[PDB]
Design a protein around this ligand. Structure first.
Ligand SMILES: *Cc1ccc(-n2ccnc2-c2cccc(*)c2)cc1OC
Ligand SMILES: *Cc1ccc(-n2ccnc2-c2cccc(*)c2)cc1OC
Ligand SMILES: [Ca+2]
Ligand SMILES: [Ca+2]
Ligand SMILES: [Ca+2]
Ligand SMILES: [Ca+2]
Ligand SMILES: [Ca+2]
Ligand SMILES: [Ca+2]
Ligand SMILES: [Cl-]
Ligand SMILES: [Cl-]
Lengths: 7, 228, 228, 7
């Protein structure tokens, strides 16, 4: 559910 | 499979595959480019990362769907098919880790390349850790931790706090702490300290660099909002 | 590849693959189920169609991206990679057409199954026609036309004008006329007549059947709005 | 650009 790096 | 294609043609086709959203092709092209044995440029490293992140991202999303169905269920079919997807995901992670080990990391001398590849190594061990359940799961977790930690040590010595690679690394290491290592306080502390130190360095940046850095700071903030 | 798996397990796994959005797996499972040699139920025919429609849909979207890049360009790389995707797309179409010919269509006696498979045959020849440029392109177009035409003849004799299969067939045959056969007036006439005759039959339907039919009528209307 | 049948 948390954000890892993404474009 | 790509041994007979020119390095430059593999790179050109990786870019075409990205435009066509053909990420499996993109990964195979970039694997072939890596196997040419030359170091990768900044742009080429990004193509490698984008390709495999999208491939494994689809596999992870599918594995989560199937694992959730399997958990509600407890015939063998759901478990069998989850195992099939899981094995394919592990295969892709092993392929990436094999490219990093043979021989991207050992030839990476500059901070930007070495931190980039060590972040990747942490990420793909993290993806292995997400599905791990056997004798080696603790070792998989420590392998992710060790790669992230070496990348963090270099990034803090060699890069400004706003550097996008440094920020993305800290973001992903914080997700590792929260999701994998059962260390939510470490995750929150890392995300806060990373955000605050980047905030204090924004004044040094051009408009374009400012946009790059603040975009990733917002992901840190989104996680802090989710976690606190 | 699927010869050792039970038919029921292949169907169960096709449904799991659909939930996981793993359409290549879904198609392979449904191919295996077809190759068991038994006729397909209504639900199973829909799984077969969904699987291959999604696979070839991704290939078509990629081919269009690459063909557009190639047209603006005129090295060999763009053409080579468009050809690679094109060959893979043709392979998937040939696989589907082979399942229909061996032996889904010849065993399909009921109007609902026979029209369904003939619509599929028209669709996959249409996809072949979209990329065709050689000596056999006219024959590919006529193969699509012939399959659609037989399906239309049966559907008009055996099904009510609101039947969803009949409506989807007429929709796709109208797209064939507009996009492939360079017959926009035929496309518009077919879409209008199909829409109007379905409109006049809606009063016979339950609430759920009404929703099924009006959903596809809206696609006919969207095309008429685009074309007129 | 026109719509063929879709889910
Ligand atoms: C993990 C990661 C973090 C940041 C970036 N990034 C953001 C903006 N620019 C970049 C970048 C592009 C190419 C090389 C290095 C950084 C990219 C990341 O992974 C691709
Ligand atoms: C081509 C096509 C057209 C309509 C349907 N459809 C709409 C609503 N219900 C159906 C259907 C489901 C299963 C079997 C037969 C019809 C489906 C189509 O292709 C799958
Ligand atoms: Ca060369
Ligand atoms: Ca396993
Ligand atoms: Ca070097
Ligand atoms: Ca059996
Ligand atoms: Ca060709
Ligand atoms: Ca029969
Ligand atoms: Cl399986
Ligand atoms: Cl190619």
């Amino acid at each position: 559910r948390p954000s890892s790096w993404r474009q | 499979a790509m041994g007979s294609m020119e390095r430059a043609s593999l790179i050109q086709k990786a870019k075409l595959a990205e435009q066509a959203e053909r990420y499996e092709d993109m990964a195979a092209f970039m694997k072939g480019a890596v196997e040419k044995g030359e170091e990768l440029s900044c742009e080429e490293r990004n193509l490698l990362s984008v390709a495999y992140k999208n491939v494994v991202g689809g596999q992870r999303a599918a594995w989560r769907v199937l694992s959730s169905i399997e958990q509600k269920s407890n015939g063998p079919e759901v478990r069998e098919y989850r195992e099939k997807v899981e094995t394919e995901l592990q295969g892709v992670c092993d392929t990436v880790l094999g490219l990093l080990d043979s021989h991207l990391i050992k030839e990476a001398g500059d901070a930007e390349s070495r931190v980039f590849y060590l972040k990747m190594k942490g990420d793909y061990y993290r993806y292995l850790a997400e599905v791990a359940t056997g004798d080696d799961k603790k070792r998989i977790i420590d392998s992710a931790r060790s790669a992230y930690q070496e990348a963090m040590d270099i990034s803090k010595k060699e890069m400004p706090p706003t550097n996008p690679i440094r920020l993305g690394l800290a973001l992903n290491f914080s997700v590792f702490h929260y999701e994998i290592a059962n260390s939510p306080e470490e995750a929150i502390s890392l995300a806060k300290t990373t955000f605050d130190e980047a905030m204090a360095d924004l004044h040094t940046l051009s408009e374009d660099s400012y946009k790059d850095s603040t975009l990733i700071m917002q992901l840190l903030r989104d996680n802090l909002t989710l976690w606190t």
